Protein backbone atom coordinates (compact mmCIF):
# COMPACT_ATOMS: atom_id res chain seq x y z
CA UNK A 1 0.00 0.00 0.00
CA UNK A 2 2.91 2.33 0.74
CA UNK A 3 3.99 2.30 -2.91
CA UNK A 4 2.32 4.94 -5.09
CA UNK A 5 1.57 4.44 -8.78
CA UNK A 6 2.37 7.33 -11.16
CA UNK A 7 -0.48 9.00 -13.02
CA UNK A 8 0.72 7.09 -16.13
CA UNK A 9 1.42 3.46 -15.13
CA UNK A 10 1.61 1.79 -18.53
CA UNK A 11 4.74 2.24 -20.63
CA UNK A 12 4.76 5.34 -22.81
CA UNK A 13 5.08 5.26 -26.58
CA UNK A 14 8.54 5.36 -28.17
CA UNK A 15 9.22 7.47 -31.26
CA UNK A 16 10.18 5.60 -34.42
CA UNK A 17 12.82 8.19 -35.34
CA UNK A 18 14.64 10.87 -33.32
CA UNK A 19 13.16 14.35 -33.43
CA UNK A 20 16.64 15.89 -33.74
CA UNK A 21 29.88 1.89 -33.98
CA UNK A 22 30.33 -1.79 -33.13
CA UNK A 23 32.08 -0.80 -29.88
CA UNK A 24 28.75 0.47 -28.54
CA UNK A 25 27.44 -3.08 -28.01
CA UNK A 26 30.77 -4.44 -26.72
CA UNK A 27 31.82 -4.70 -23.09
CA UNK A 28 30.21 -4.10 -19.70
CA UNK A 29 27.60 -1.38 -19.39
CA UNK A 30 28.61 1.70 -17.40
CA UNK A 31 25.08 3.13 -17.02
CA UNK A 32 21.66 1.91 -15.86
CA UNK A 33 23.19 -0.90 -13.80
CA UNK A 34 21.26 -0.15 -10.58
CA UNK A 35 17.53 -0.24 -9.85
CA UNK A 36 15.87 3.17 -9.62
CA UNK A 37 12.44 3.32 -7.95
CA UNK A 38 11.66 -0.24 -9.01
CA UNK A 39 12.39 -3.64 -7.49
CA UNK A 40 12.22 -5.74 -10.67
CA UNK A 41 13.75 -5.25 -14.11
CA UNK A 42 14.97 -7.03 -17.24
CA UNK A 43 18.75 -7.47 -17.16
CA UNK A 44 20.62 -7.49 -20.47
CA UNK A 45 23.20 -10.29 -20.59
CA UNK A 46 24.29 -9.51 -24.16
CA UNK A 47 25.00 -6.65 -26.51
CA UNK A 48 22.59 -5.91 -29.34
CA UNK A 49 20.94 -2.99 -31.06
CA UNK A 50 17.22 -2.37 -30.47
CA UNK A 51 15.12 -1.02 -33.33
CA UNK A 52 11.69 0.53 -32.83
CA UNK A 53 10.00 -2.74 -33.77
CA UNK A 54 11.22 -4.28 -30.53
CA UNK A 55 10.05 -1.29 -28.49
CA UNK A 56 6.48 -1.62 -29.78
CA UNK A 57 6.54 -5.35 -29.04
CA UNK A 58 7.79 -4.87 -25.47
CA UNK A 59 5.44 -1.96 -24.77
CA UNK A 60 2.39 -3.85 -26.05
CA UNK A 61 3.17 -7.04 -24.13
CA UNK A 62 4.22 -5.42 -20.85
CA UNK A 63 1.24 -3.05 -20.78
CA UNK A 64 -1.46 -5.66 -21.36
CA UNK A 65 0.05 -8.19 -18.94
CA UNK A 66 0.65 -5.65 -16.16
CA UNK A 67 -2.18 -4.30 -14.03
CA UNK A 68 -2.14 -0.47 -13.92
CA UNK A 69 -3.11 -0.16 -10.26
CA UNK A 70 -0.86 -2.97 -9.01
CA UNK A 71 2.39 -2.05 -10.77
CA UNK A 72 4.10 0.58 -12.92
CA UNK A 73 6.85 0.37 -15.55
CA UNK A 74 9.47 2.97 -16.50
CA UNK A 75 11.57 2.99 -19.67
CA UNK A 76 15.32 2.87 -19.13
CA UNK A 77 16.38 2.72 -22.80
CA UNK A 78 16.53 6.04 -24.73
CA UNK A 79 14.91 6.57 -28.12
CA UNK A 80 16.59 5.07 -31.21
CA UNK A 81 19.37 7.42 -32.28
CA UNK A 82 21.96 5.31 -34.09
CA UNK A 83 21.60 5.50 -37.90
CA UNK A 84 21.65 2.20 -39.81
CA UNK A 85 22.05 2.49 -43.59
CA UNK A 86 21.17 -0.49 -45.78
CA UNK A 87 18.72 5.94 -43.13
CA UNK A 88 17.02 2.56 -43.39
CA UNK A 89 16.18 2.34 -39.67
CA UNK A 90 17.21 3.58 -36.23
CA UNK A 91 18.40 1.41 -33.34
CA UNK A 92 19.37 1.70 -29.67
CA UNK A 93 22.57 -0.12 -28.62
CA UNK A 94 22.44 -1.92 -25.27
CA UNK A 95 25.59 -3.09 -23.50
CA UNK A 96 25.77 -6.23 -21.39
CA UNK A 97 24.74 -5.86 -17.77
CA UNK A 98 22.20 -3.10 -18.47
CA UNK A 99 18.60 -3.04 -17.24
CA UNK A 100 16.47 -2.65 -20.36
CA UNK A 101 13.14 -2.29 -18.53
CA UNK A 102 12.29 -1.79 -14.85
CA UNK A 103 9.16 -2.94 -13.03
CA UNK A 104 8.17 -1.54 -9.65
CA UNK A 105 4.97 -1.60 -7.67
CA UNK A 106 2.81 -3.76 -5.42
CA UNK A 107 3.86 -7.13 -6.82
CA UNK A 108 6.22 -10.06 -6.28
CA UNK A 109 9.03 -11.27 -8.51
CA UNK A 110 7.18 -14.50 -9.30
CA UNK A 111 4.17 -12.45 -10.40
CA UNK A 112 6.39 -10.10 -12.41
CA UNK A 113 8.79 -12.69 -13.83
CA UNK A 114 6.10 -14.25 -16.00
CA UNK A 115 5.52 -11.44 -18.48
CA UNK A 116 8.98 -9.88 -18.09
CA UNK A 117 10.70 -13.19 -18.86
CA UNK A 118 8.37 -13.71 -21.83
CA UNK A 119 9.33 -10.32 -23.27
CA UNK A 120 13.00 -11.00 -22.49
CA UNK A 121 13.15 -14.00 -24.83
CA UNK A 122 12.02 -11.76 -27.71
CA UNK A 123 14.88 -9.29 -27.23
CA UNK A 124 17.57 -9.80 -29.92
CA UNK A 125 20.10 -10.44 -27.14
CA UNK A 126 20.16 -12.67 -24.08
CA UNK A 127 18.17 -11.13 -21.23
CA UNK A 128 16.75 -12.42 -17.95
CA UNK A 129 14.21 -10.84 -15.62
CA UNK A 130 15.83 -9.85 -12.33
CA UNK A 131 14.86 -8.47 -8.93
CA UNK A 132 16.74 -6.57 -6.23
CA UNK A 133 17.35 -9.74 -4.23
CA UNK A 134 18.03 -11.88 -7.29
CA UNK A 135 20.40 -9.41 -8.95
CA UNK A 136 22.32 -8.85 -5.71
CA UNK A 137 22.58 -12.62 -5.25
CA UNK A 138 23.78 -12.82 -8.86
CA UNK A 139 26.54 -10.29 -8.20
CA UNK A 140 27.31 -11.68 -4.73
CA UNK A 141 27.46 -15.21 -6.15
CA UNK A 142 29.86 -14.09 -8.88
CA UNK A 143 32.19 -12.51 -6.32
CA UNK A 144 32.13 -15.72 -4.28
CA UNK A 145 33.26 -17.76 -7.29
CA UNK A 146 36.26 -15.49 -7.84
CA UNK A 147 37.47 -15.56 -4.23
CA UNK A 148 37.01 -19.32 -3.80
CA UNK A 149 38.33 -20.25 -7.25
CA UNK A 150 40.88 -23.05 -6.93
CA UNK A 151 42.46 -22.53 -10.35
CA UNK A 152 45.81 -20.74 -9.78
CA UNK A 153 45.67 -19.37 -13.35
CA UNK A 154 43.21 -16.64 -14.36
CA UNK A 155 42.58 -14.76 -17.58
CA UNK A 156 43.35 -11.40 -15.95
CA UNK A 157 46.69 -12.51 -14.52
CA UNK A 158 47.81 -14.08 -17.80
CA UNK A 159 46.57 -11.18 -19.93
CA UNK A 160 47.96 -8.38 -17.75
CA UNK A 161 51.42 -9.94 -17.44
CA UNK A 162 51.39 -10.97 -21.13
CA UNK A 163 52.36 -14.49 -20.12
CA UNK A 164 53.18 -16.73 -23.10
CA UNK A 165 52.86 -13.60 -25.23
CA UNK A 166 49.10 -14.13 -25.02
CA UNK A 167 48.48 -10.51 -26.00
CA UNK A 168 49.33 -11.38 -29.61
CA UNK A 169 46.08 -13.40 -29.86
CA UNK A 170 44.07 -11.07 -27.59
CA UNK A 171 42.37 -7.72 -28.03
CA UNK A 172 43.44 -4.60 -26.13
CA UNK A 173 39.95 -4.44 -24.61
CA UNK A 174 40.44 -7.92 -23.13
CA UNK A 175 42.68 -6.45 -20.43
CA UNK A 176 39.65 -4.65 -18.99
CA UNK A 177 37.12 -7.35 -19.88
CA UNK A 178 39.35 -10.07 -18.36
CA UNK A 179 37.84 -12.80 -20.55
CA UNK A 180 34.26 -12.43 -19.31
CA UNK A 181 33.25 -10.59 -22.51
CA UNK A 182 33.88 -11.96 -26.02
CA UNK A 183 32.68 -9.36 -28.49
CA UNK A 184 29.00 -8.65 -27.93
CA UNK A 185 28.52 -11.99 -26.15
CA UNK A 186 29.04 -12.03 -22.38
CA UNK A 187 30.02 -15.23 -20.59
CA UNK A 188 28.71 -15.24 -16.99
CA UNK A 189 30.45 -18.46 -15.91
CA UNK A 190 33.84 -16.95 -16.76
CA UNK A 191 35.72 -15.86 -13.64
Amino acid sequence: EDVSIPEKPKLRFIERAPLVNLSDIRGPSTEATEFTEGNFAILALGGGYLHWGHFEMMRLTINRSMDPKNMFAIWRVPAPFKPITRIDHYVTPVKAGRLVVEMGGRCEFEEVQGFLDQVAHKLPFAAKAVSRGTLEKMRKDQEERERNNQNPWTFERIATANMLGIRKVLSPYDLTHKGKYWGKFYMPKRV
Binding site: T160, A161, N162, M163, L164, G165, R167, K168, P172
Partner: protein, 122 residues
Protein backbone atom coordinates in the same frame (compact mmCIF):
# COMPACT_ATOMS: atom_id res chain seq x y z
CA UNK B 1 46.33 -2.89 -33.25
CA UNK B 2 48.97 -5.16 -31.75
CA UNK B 3 51.82 -3.21 -30.14
CA UNK B 4 54.59 -3.52 -27.58
CA UNK B 5 53.33 -4.58 -24.15
CA UNK B 6 54.21 -2.61 -21.01
CA UNK B 7 53.75 -4.85 -17.97
CA UNK B 8 52.60 -3.21 -14.70
CA UNK B 9 55.36 -3.01 -12.11
CA UNK B 10 53.14 -4.92 -9.66
CA UNK B 11 53.72 -8.15 -11.61
CA UNK B 12 57.42 -7.88 -10.69
CA UNK B 13 56.87 -7.26 -6.95
CA UNK B 14 57.49 -10.58 -5.23
CA UNK B 15 55.27 -11.31 -2.24
CA UNK B 16 56.17 -13.18 0.97
CA UNK B 17 54.46 -16.30 -0.40
CA UNK B 18 56.56 -16.28 -3.58
CA UNK B 19 59.80 -16.16 -1.58
CA UNK B 20 59.03 -19.40 0.26
CA UNK B 21 57.91 -21.11 -2.95
CA UNK B 22 60.99 -20.29 -5.03
CA UNK B 23 63.60 -20.00 -2.27
CA UNK B 24 64.81 -16.48 -3.00
CA UNK B 25 66.14 -13.90 -0.54
CA UNK B 26 65.02 -10.28 -1.04
CA UNK B 27 67.62 -9.02 1.45
CA UNK B 28 70.46 -10.55 -0.62
CA UNK B 29 69.55 -10.52 -4.33
CA UNK B 30 71.38 -12.88 -6.64
CA UNK B 31 74.08 -11.18 -8.68
CA UNK B 32 73.82 -13.01 -12.02
CA UNK B 33 71.05 -14.55 -14.13
CA UNK B 34 71.15 -17.86 -15.95
CA UNK B 35 69.08 -17.33 -19.10
CA UNK B 36 68.13 -19.99 -21.63
CA UNK B 37 65.84 -19.65 -24.61
CA UNK B 38 63.06 -22.24 -24.54
CA UNK B 39 60.64 -20.74 -27.08
CA UNK B 40 61.04 -19.88 -30.74
CA UNK B 41 61.16 -16.29 -31.96
CA UNK B 42 59.20 -17.37 -35.03
CA UNK B 43 55.71 -15.85 -35.12
CA UNK B 44 56.86 -13.24 -32.59
CA UNK B 45 57.25 -9.48 -33.12
CA UNK B 46 60.50 -8.21 -34.58
CA UNK B 47 61.39 -6.29 -31.40
CA UNK B 48 61.38 -9.58 -29.50
CA UNK B 49 63.58 -11.10 -32.21
CA UNK B 50 66.04 -8.23 -31.73
CA UNK B 51 66.09 -8.56 -27.94
CA UNK B 52 66.84 -12.28 -28.22
CA UNK B 53 69.83 -11.55 -30.46
CA UNK B 54 71.16 -8.79 -28.19
CA UNK B 55 71.01 -11.11 -25.17
CA UNK B 56 72.88 -13.84 -27.04
CA UNK B 57 70.00 -16.33 -26.92
CA UNK B 58 69.65 -17.15 -30.62
CA UNK B 59 70.46 -20.81 -29.94
CA UNK B 60 67.84 -22.54 -27.82
CA UNK B 61 68.67 -24.40 -24.60
CA UNK B 62 72.04 -22.64 -24.34
CA UNK B 63 72.76 -21.10 -20.91
CA UNK B 64 73.77 -17.44 -21.02
CA UNK B 65 74.89 -15.49 -17.95
CA UNK B 66 73.64 -11.92 -17.52
CA UNK B 67 73.88 -9.27 -14.83
CA UNK B 68 70.84 -8.84 -12.57
CA UNK B 69 70.61 -5.09 -13.14
CA UNK B 70 67.62 -2.91 -14.10
CA UNK B 71 68.76 -2.26 -17.67
CA UNK B 72 69.28 -5.96 -18.38
CA UNK B 73 66.04 -6.86 -16.59
CA UNK B 74 64.18 -4.41 -18.83
CA UNK B 75 65.31 -6.45 -21.83
CA UNK B 76 64.46 -9.77 -20.16
CA UNK B 77 60.95 -8.54 -19.35
CA UNK B 78 60.26 -7.99 -23.05
CA UNK B 79 61.15 -11.62 -23.86
CA UNK B 80 60.25 -13.16 -20.47
CA UNK B 81 57.72 -15.46 -22.16
CA UNK B 82 60.44 -16.99 -24.37
CA UNK B 83 63.14 -17.71 -21.76
CA UNK B 84 63.87 -19.43 -18.47
CA UNK B 85 65.51 -17.28 -15.78
CA UNK B 86 67.31 -19.04 -12.93
CA UNK B 87 69.72 -17.40 -10.45
CA UNK B 88 73.34 -18.41 -10.81
CA UNK B 89 74.55 -20.13 -7.65
CA UNK B 90 78.18 -20.26 -6.50
CA UNK B 91 78.30 -22.87 -3.71
CA UNK B 92 82.12 -22.82 -3.87
CA UNK B 93 82.53 -19.13 -4.76
CA UNK B 94 83.78 -17.52 -7.93
CA UNK B 95 86.17 -19.64 -10.03
CA UNK B 96 89.80 -18.71 -9.51
CA UNK B 97 92.44 -18.69 -12.24
CA UNK B 98 93.34 -22.26 -11.26
CA UNK B 99 89.71 -23.43 -11.42
CA UNK B 100 88.83 -21.83 -14.78
CA UNK B 101 89.40 -25.09 -16.68
CA UNK B 102 87.62 -27.30 -14.11
CA UNK B 103 84.21 -25.61 -13.87
CA UNK B 104 80.80 -27.00 -14.79
CA UNK B 105 77.31 -25.49 -14.77
CA UNK B 106 74.87 -28.04 -13.39
CA UNK B 107 71.16 -28.26 -14.15
CA UNK B 108 70.33 -27.07 -10.62
CA UNK B 109 71.89 -23.73 -11.58
CA UNK B 110 75.08 -24.04 -9.52
CA UNK B 111 78.53 -23.41 -10.96
CA UNK B 112 80.99 -25.88 -9.44
CA UNK B 113 84.70 -25.06 -9.62
CA UNK B 114 85.77 -28.73 -9.51
CA UNK B 115 84.58 -31.39 -11.99
CA UNK B 116 86.29 -34.68 -11.17
CA UNK B 117 83.68 -36.90 -12.88
CA UNK B 118 84.21 -39.38 -10.04
CA UNK B 119 81.64 -40.83 -7.61
CA UNK B 120 81.35 -39.19 -4.22
CA UNK B 121 82.49 -41.38 -1.35
CA UNK B 122 79.75 -43.33 0.45
Amino acid sequence: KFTRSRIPEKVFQASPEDHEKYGGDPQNPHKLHIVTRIKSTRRRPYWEKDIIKMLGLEKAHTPQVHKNIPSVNAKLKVVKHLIRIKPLKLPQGLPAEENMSNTCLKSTGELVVQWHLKPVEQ
